[PDB]
Scaffold this active site. Structure first.
Site, PDB file in Angstrom:
ATOM      1  N   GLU A  84       0.623  -1.220   0.027  1.00  0.00           N
ATOM      2  CA  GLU A  84       0.078  -0.164   0.149  1.00  0.00           C
ATOM      3  C   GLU A  84       1.102   1.070  -0.022  1.00  0.00           C
ATOM      4  O   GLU A  84       0.863   2.344  -0.575  1.00  0.00           O
ATOM      5  CB  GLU A  84      -1.570  -0.421   1.152  1.00  0.00           C
ATOM      6  N   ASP A  88      -6.053  -3.023  -2.227  1.00  0.00           N
ATOM      7  CA  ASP A  88      -5.444  -1.890  -2.527  1.00  0.00           C
ATOM      8  C   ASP A  88      -4.339  -0.959  -3.388  1.00  0.00           C
ATOM      9  O   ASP A  88      -3.619  -0.783  -3.712  1.00  0.00           O
ATOM     10  CB  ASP A  88      -5.504  -1.021  -1.213  1.00  0.00           C
TER      11      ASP A  88
END
Length: 386
Positions: A74, A135
């Site tokens: 991330e 993500d």
């Protein structure tokens, strides 16, 4: 070198306002300065197990299967988008980006090799040892599309081809579910109904569609908007917020301690704090009306909740709007400001928010997301178009 979208692009998206009590030059200067501070503190390239490899220094996490986590996918994603956007200002942007990409591909996922394992640890054994987090890959893949439009794909790395492989062979294959939602990672089921709203990067998905021609991304976008509304009308009718994690169908808030992350996984907490920016960007960049609706509801609620004072925003809220957090941190504050740019009557609030965030430095998580938000609200996050 040879930037086709050099910083600052300072674009003016239709229907959105920027802070206006300072000049555009001042906006750009605040971003340049924030970047230099961010880079100096978080950008690293000291991996003994991977020379030429870069990563973003995250917070001291817990034991990652024995390994010591230095960063996550991330953080890798945030850093890669930031890096390509600052190209033109940072003369070493492409070198850094390629170094970040080297790490992303070397630390590939143990499940789907087209994705990145979520943990960066300085060890050959950790390279290809961890599974993915949706993500991280979404930002990384998206960054490759920016890289393509920034430097072209005729050099050392074929940015466009890498992007297409990651998007299609990676994210779609492992993270897009059978009912067209986004699961938590490549370790998750293809029919999983467990989802993390901060993963609903609508504007990213638009670009995926435009650069692959795969309508799958459009149906995912439409479904996610349906899910958001179905969720909110029932669980957050007066705030428009969404929980860190969502499960089942009809969608509902995940239970507390979901995945053992925190006791507030059922509320608007640290994961969800990023949602307002992810959504509003769709209206700004692609004019999606459903984004403006979701953004205005949240924006108006938070403004009334704090009586127009951004410093009164806390780090965490129950879906009904009750306070959980106790202080103002950028990952919460900045997205709330960004979600307010679609209505010209929020100019003062946008100005106060900008003043609060422009020089706000604290830690990896808030700082990194704050920089992404700042880049976007100043018009310096341009959109990649084929």
């Amino acid at each position: 070198a040879k930037e086709m979208k050099p910083f600052p692009q300072q674009v003016n998206y239709a229907g959105v306002i920027k802070p206006n009590h300072v000049t555009q030059e001042s906006l750009n200067a605040s971003v340049r300065s924030y970047y230099d501070n961010w880079k100096k503190k978080y950008l690293k390239n000291d991996l003994s197990s991977l020379p030429g490899g870069y990563y973003v220094k995250g917070e001291i996490t817990g034991d990652a299967d024995g390994f010591k986590p230095l960063g996550t996918s991330e953080g890798q994603g945030y850093g890669m988008i930031i890096t390509v956007l600052m190209a033109g200002y940072d003369s070493n942007a492409q070198k850094i980006y390629d170094g970040l990409f080297k790490t992303a591909r070397t630390f590939k996922s143990s499940q789907n090799p087209n994705l990145m394992g979520w943990v960066v640890a300085d060890s050959k054994k950790a390279q290809g040892h961890f599974d993915s987090a949706t993500d991280g890959d979404l930002d990384i893949a998206y960054s490759l599309l920016l890289a393509h439009k920034q430097w072209g794909s005729n050099g050392t790395v074929n940015y466009l081809k890498e992007a297409q492989d990651m998007i299609t062979k990676g994210i779609k294959a492992s993270n897009v579910t059978n009912n067209n939602q986004l699961n938590l990672g490549d370790w998750d089921s293809k029919s999983s109904l467990d989802t993390r709203p901060s993963d609903w990067m609508m504007s990213h998905l638009r670009a995926f569609y435009e650069f692959t021609g795969d309508k799958t991304w459009l149906t995912v976008i439409n479904n996610l908007y349906d899910v958001y509304t179905q969720f909110s009308n029932k669980y957050s009718p007066n705030t428009g917020l969404i929980s860190d994690f969502v499960v089942k169908n009809p969608p509902q808030p995940a239970p507390k301690d979901f995945l053992d992350e925190s006791e507030y996984t059922n509320a608007y907490y640290y994961n969800a704090s990023r949602v307002p920016l992810r959504i509003v960007m769709d209206y700004a960049m692609y004019g999606e009306k459903r984004s403006k609706v979701i953004s205005d509801k949240v924006s108006s609620w938070i403004q009334n909740k704090t009586n127009g004072n951004p410093s009164k925003i806390v780090d965490g809220y129950q879906l009904n709007g009750s306070n959980i957090g106790s202080y103002p941190t950028a990952v919460f504050v900045s997205p709330f400001i960004a979600a307010s740019i679609t209505s010209s009557n929020n100019q003062k609030w946008v100005n106060s928010g900008w003043d609060w965030m422009k020089n706000k430095r604290e830690r990896y998580f808030s700082d990194s997301y704050n920089l992404l938000t700042m880049l976007f609200i100043t018009g310096n996050w341009w959109k990649p178009v084929p």
